[PDB]
């Protein structure tokens, strides 16, 4: 960025100094935050096993070591969602169990957690023509189940008791 000779700082977003000019040497340097991100944990049932896999949100798998130790590079497979630790990549594709994101899914299979691309479903091709039809010759009656909530628990809370429980002075301040 080409600062004007009378310009010192730079604020493209109007609340943080994007770039500054060093006084000793008039060259200008741009400021970038130190990176961050949330930490999420992949896990099967607690009583199923104890192995877990951690996911860092939207960070290159280069700053994760210098970021519960990482313990060097051991299957540091990188995805669009972020850095995935503790799971092997699988070329096979199955249905989803734990949706991690961006077409990726993980599940516990008998290194205990595998991650795979989303498998959409069974493929099938229709034997189409212009003079062929299909008609069932038998049937089958099936029964399914659906559940729908109707009402929530009917609750009411007192006003003064919660706020200023049995205090005259607190009530007087409240009014």
């Amino acid at each position, epitope marked *: 960025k080409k600062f004007l000779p009378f310009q010192q700082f730079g604020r493209d977003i109007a609340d943080t100094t994007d770039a500054v000019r060093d006084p000793q040497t008039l060259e200008i340097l741009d400021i970038t935050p130190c990176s961050f991100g949330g930490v999420s944990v992949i896990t099967p049932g607690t009583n199923t096993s*104890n*192995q*877990v*896999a951690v996911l860092y949100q939207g960070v290159n798998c280069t700053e994760v070591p210098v970021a519960r*130790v990482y*313990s*060097t590079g*051991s*299957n540091v497979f990188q995805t669009r969602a972020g850095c995935l*630790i*503790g799971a092997e990549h699988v070329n096979n594709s199955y249905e989803c169990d734990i949706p991690i994101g961006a077409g990726i899914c993980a599940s516990y299979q008998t*290194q*205990s957690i595998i991650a795979y691309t989303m498998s959409l479903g069974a493929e099938n091709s229709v034997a189409y023509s212009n003079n062929s039809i299909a008609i069932p010759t038998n049937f089958t009656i099936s029964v399914t189940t659906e559940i729908l909530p109707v009402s929530m628990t009917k609750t009411s809370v007192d006003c003064t008791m919660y706020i200023c429980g049995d205090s005259t002075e607190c009530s007087n301040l409240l009014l």
Partner: nanobody
Amino acid sequence: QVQLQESGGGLVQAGGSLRLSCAASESIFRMELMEWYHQAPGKQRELVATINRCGSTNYSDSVKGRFIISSDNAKNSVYLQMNSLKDEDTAVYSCHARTWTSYWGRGTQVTVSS
């Protein structure tokens, strides 16, 4: 650094004595599980000996009587002494550890001359 490095492999005639020694940078004690894996050529990997955190020790059927797994708490490592070596014991040995994610080491190709 290699979080777990193995040493002791090499060639040896049948019936000799050998001590596989793989050492890990991290404390061998919070790791909760040490194990050794060797795979014969043309064969699948198999477990050799396991030692849990509590101290329970188990050996494979072709391992009892000769191979004993140990771990001295002076230099953090695990020890595995081989003796009365026989030719099908020739394989690529690797020691396995699992604190909350699998760890693996390389090397230690043992050959038994017969």
